[PDB]
């Protein structure tokens, strides 16, 4: 038995010490351990081999000739293939796969969310804009009520001074005058209670915001990705994902195809490395669609700048392959099920993906030392202050000119 | 050029009994995912089928002593039937005796919980930081302080001052709201009272603000499990399964720490977390208000999450990996074409279409789509209502005063 494979980490990787004592250990990967286990079960002899053509199985239409491990299996150069090889109709017609040992599908990759750059007017964040608008309306209404109830029921509280009193009450800065009638006093007390509650709530929610950081993914699915157009899509130019989108007939994926066809600059890339680089450096504006296993592997590799979001857009499986008419096909078909039921495959998955994690667990760190507030957090209020001062001088000059003339 | 007795089993939505059973007949008497799938398979293989069901209503399983199969695989290996189109999971023993087609649908163990209900913050929630006892005792203390101030300010005849009862109440209210009034005490008694009231207010306001900050912060660090590790390390939430089945076997034979811990918890269950039917688990999680979790095949989880009432949620990726498949007897003439048809159908997207059709399109819940955490108008609505009430009362008292003072 001669086992074919292909260089794709962590399925195939040359060992760090292949120059010395190479033996059979010059190659290392998930597929290597799997081949060892299945040969052990079937009691066969395997010397690991690599296909000189590192291209995956496919047949030239103009020649009707296969290019890859498929050629090895059909033409007898190789007795068996153990690689991240996906089951498919055309390939099943010539060889005999086994039941999947790895179930997967198209997925999504994005830049890991990070502390956003604080914007101006962020100091309103703890309170919803509706609360601010209702605050303004209540200020106007209470001032108006005070004006009325003071004109029509005196024991000073014109409209102007009424607005001044309400504003001073909201800022806890005190008053130059206080109502002397029961109605004005009622209004003032209620306004005071309102201000107390609102200031306390603002302070408390700001403390919460600054104590625990929760960064939320803008997208949590693929339909939610199709709904908006701010973020980009991405597919390797010559790979099954592009064809799957092309031949699809579901609304969402057809919409994605239309976008990815009518969008510039070129969303597609020539290599997965280019797409991951674009995602890393785009700062969250690029989303790459690849296979889930590679995405999980990447997410556990430094600089740990990416995650996988959402489920899977398709169902596929990686299947061991044997030539038609072989006798190893049945024992391997039973062996993969043996391993799956026992737990070997899950352990290997943990082994090459989770363990050996250049990153950490889901939450490697917590309670990161808090940062002192920076001018960028409260620059908007400075801008507002200076604008108010300019407006005040402008109003004073206007009054000057109006009165002098 | 004859018919084929395809076996199935009524487990919704894979195979269903039509709206009106008595009126229809033959294959057209049923509806579901698997019947349509068999339709396409017959189309792509070119044969007729006389649909059928397994009498035992059970999936394949072998009695050890009797060494006989109980269900579909029994209906096949013994020649009673020629095909099987159902959620017939792929296993070692089953595959040892029959021919499994490539999976048409993948799945695995999952988690079901109570769907997080849209929180009703509650009018008058802004008082929660302080117990109502504190608020009422505050009111009583305010009255007492006002009366004492009035007394110590207008007890002597030497003044016979501005500190009447009404203005005393006004001063105390302004002091509590940290605003201040035009008038202030000048004697020593009034100043003592004012100072002690001021200290009281300082402490109370600081306590309100601090406890509110604590409320919001703790409500802001809550982390739903979103996985099994979160469900494993924690112990407050209950996570059960069926009494018997493949989940219990998977946990028993589990060689991994997380599922070994889950099995240890399940064995050391007080009360018994296990239940007998998926209906039992669904109702138990529905009523337990999040204190319970149920593990089951992901597919039933999705169907249930798309059922009325729509109050269940699925969290986390599938713990394991499995597969359903079309089965045939050993040494048949169908394995080739059936496998080709399944692969073709999946490649051209039929199966995802049917899954969407029977899990969401026929979904009563019809839900498919903001973690801002900023205070919303519902949090502080009670104080707005109080404001409107106070303004209205003020206008009413204005009308009274206008009618009054007639002469």
């Amino acid at each position: 038995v001669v086992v074919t494979t292909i260089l794709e980490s962590p399925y195939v990787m040359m060992k760090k010490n292949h120059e010395m004592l190479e033996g059979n250990e010059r190659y290392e990967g998930y597929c290597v351990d799997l081949a060892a286990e299945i040969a052990k079960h079937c009691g066969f002899k395997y010397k690991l081999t690599i296909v000189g053509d590192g291209k995956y199985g496919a047949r030239d239409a103009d020649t009707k000739i296969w290019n890859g491990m498929v050629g090895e299996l059909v033409y007898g150069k190789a007795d068996i293939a153990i690689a991240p090889l996906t089951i498919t109709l055309v390939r099943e017609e010539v060889i005999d796969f086994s039941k999947p040992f790895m179930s997967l599908g198209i997925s999504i990759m994005i830049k890991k969310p990070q502390k956003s750059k604080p914007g101006v007017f962020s100091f309103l964040d703890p309170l919803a804009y509706e609360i601010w608008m209702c605050i303004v309306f209540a200020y106007i209404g209470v001032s108006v009520v005070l004006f009325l109830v003071s004109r029509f029921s005196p024991y000073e509280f014109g409209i102007f001074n009424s607005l001044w009193f309400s504003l001073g009450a909201f800022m806890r800065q005190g008053c130059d005058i206080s109502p002397r009638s029961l109605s004005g006093r009622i209004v003032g007390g209620v306004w005071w209670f309102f201000t107390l509650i609102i200031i306390s709530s603002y302070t408390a929610n700001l403390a919460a915001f600054l104590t625990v950081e929760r960064m939320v993914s803008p997208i949590e699915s693929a339909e939610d990705l199709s709904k908006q157009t701010e973020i980009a899509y991405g597919t390797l130019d010559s790979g099954s994902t592009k064809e799957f989108f092309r031949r699809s007939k579901i609304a969402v994926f057809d919409k994605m195809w239309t976008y990815m066809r009518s969008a510039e600059p070129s969303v597609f890339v020539r290599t997965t490395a280019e797409g991951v680089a674009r995602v890393r450096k785009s700062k969250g504006k690029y989303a790459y669609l690849l296979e889930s296993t590679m995405n999980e592997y990447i997410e556990q590799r430094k600089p740990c700048d990416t995650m996988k979001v959402g489920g899977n857009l398709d169902s596929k499986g990686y299947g061991i392959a044997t030539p038609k008419g072989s006798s190893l096909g049945t024992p391997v078909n039973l062996a993969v099920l043996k391993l799956s039921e026992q737990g070997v495959l899950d352990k290997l998955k943990n082994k090459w993906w989770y363990d050996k994690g250049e990153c950490g667990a889901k939450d490697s760190g917590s309670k990161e030392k808090t940062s002192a507030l920076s001018l960028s957090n409260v620059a908007g209020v400075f801008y507002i202050l200076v604008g108010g001062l300019g407006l005040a001088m402008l109003v004073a000059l206007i009054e000057f000119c109006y009165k002098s003339r | 050029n004859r018919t084929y007795i395809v076996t199935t089993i009524l487990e919704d939505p894979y195979v269903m009994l039509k709206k009106n059973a008595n009126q229809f007949e033959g294959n057209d008497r049923y509806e579901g995912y698997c019947v349509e799938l068999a339709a396409e398979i017959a189309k792509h293989v070119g044969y007729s089928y006389r649909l059928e069901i397994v009498s035992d209503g059970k999936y394949g399983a072998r009695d050890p002593d009797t060494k006989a199969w109980n269900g579909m695989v029994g209906e096949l290996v013994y020649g009673r039937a020629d095909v099987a189109v159902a959620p017939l999971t792929i296993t070692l023993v089953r595959e040892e005796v029959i021919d499994f087609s490539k999976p048409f649908m993948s799945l695995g163990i999952s988690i079901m919980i109570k769907k997080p209900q849209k929180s009703k913050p509650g009018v008058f929630s802004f008082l929660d930081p302080l117990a109502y006892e504190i608020w009422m005792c505050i009111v009583f203390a305010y009255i007492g302080v006002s009366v004492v101030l009035f007394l110590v300010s207008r007890f002597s005849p030497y003044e016979w001052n501005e500190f009447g009862i009404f203005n005393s109440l006004w001063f105390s209210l302004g002091a509590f709201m940290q605003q201040g009034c035009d008038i202030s005490p000048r004697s020593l008694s009034g100043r003592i009272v004012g100072g002690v009231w001021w200290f009281f207010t300082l402490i109370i306001i600081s306590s309100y603000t601090a406890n509110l900050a604590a409320f919001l912060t703790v409500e802001r660090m809550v982390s739903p499990i979103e996985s099994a590790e979160d469900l494993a390390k924690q112990t407050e939430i209950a996570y059960g399964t069926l009494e018997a089945g493949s989940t219990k076997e998977f946990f028993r034979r589990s060689k991994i720490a997380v599922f070994e811990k889950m099995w240890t918890y399940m064995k050391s269950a007080e009360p018994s977390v296990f239940v007998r039917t998926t209906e039992e688990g669904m109702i138990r999680v529905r009523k337990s208000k999040g204190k319970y979790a149920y593990l089951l095949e992901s597919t039933m989880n999705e169907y249930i999450e798309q059922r009325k009432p729509c109050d269940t949620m699925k969290v986390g990726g599938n713990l394991d990996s499995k597969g359903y498949g079309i089965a045939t007897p050993k040494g048949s003439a169908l394995r080739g074409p059936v496998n080709l048809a399944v692969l073709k159908l999946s490649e051209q997207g039929v199966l995802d279409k049917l899954k969407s059709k029977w899990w969401y399109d026929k979904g009563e819940c019809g839900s498919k789509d903001d973690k801002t955490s900023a205070l919303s108008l519902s949090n502080v609505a009670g104080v707005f209502y109080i404001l409107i009430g106070g303004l209205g009362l003020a206008m009413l008292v204005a009308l009274i005063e206008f009618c009054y003072k007639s002469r």
């Binding site: - | 007492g144 009366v147 207008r154 007890f155």
Partner: protein, 187 residues
């Protein structure tokens, strides 16, 4: 007027005294579960002196309380001991009722010796002090009824004590106003 105000003063004093007395002597202050009845416990309508049950065959029969279940330092242990002593004695509500009675006596006597004016002042001082004692008493009661998701509620004796406090404050205000008017009559 003046006689009207004095009449209302006296009536309020007597009403507050009666309210406080029966609030003390009705043991309908609190509703909760106790574990003394027979498992979170059985219903009960507790009181100031003697808890009392209303479930099972024990309904209608009921006994005093300890106020010292665990062990502490008899001579001087901590603020907990003083709190429990005050709660058991309930000397603050009793003091409030006594002060209301004394204020009523003073104001009633004021009708005779109409020349004197400090009588009404003393009555008002007594009423205000009664209010203060009442609020302290309720604070102590509530602070002592804390264990350390149960349920509880308050009964009409509680609200009667509160009404006594309110009436005491009102009557103190009225008495002070009476004294002010009388001093006004002097030039």
């Amino acid at each position: 007027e003046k006689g009207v105000q004095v009449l209302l003063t006296t009536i309020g004093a007597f009403a507050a005294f009666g309210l406080m007395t029966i609030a003390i002597s009705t043991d309908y202050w609190l509703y909760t579960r106790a574990l003394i009845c027979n498992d979170p416990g059985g219903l009960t309508h507790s009181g100031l002196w003697r808890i009392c049950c209303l479930e099972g065959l024990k309904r209608g029969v009921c006994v005093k309380i300890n106020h010292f279940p665990e062990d502490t330092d008899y001579d001087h242990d901590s603020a907990e001991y003083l709190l429990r002593v005050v709660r058991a004695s309930s000397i603050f509500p009793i003091l409030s009722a006594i002060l209301l009675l004394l204020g009523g006596v003073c104001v009633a006597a004021s009708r005779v010796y109409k020349s004197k004016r400090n009588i009404i002042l003393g009555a008002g001082i007594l009423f205000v002090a009664a209010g203060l004692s009442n609020i302290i008493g309720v604070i102590v009661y509530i602070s002592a009824n804390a264990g350390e998701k149960n349920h509880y509620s308050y009964g009409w004796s509680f609200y009667f004590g509160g009404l006594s406090f309110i009436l005491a404050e009102v009557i103190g205000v009225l008495a002070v106003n009476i004294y002010i008017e009388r001093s006004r009559e002097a030039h």
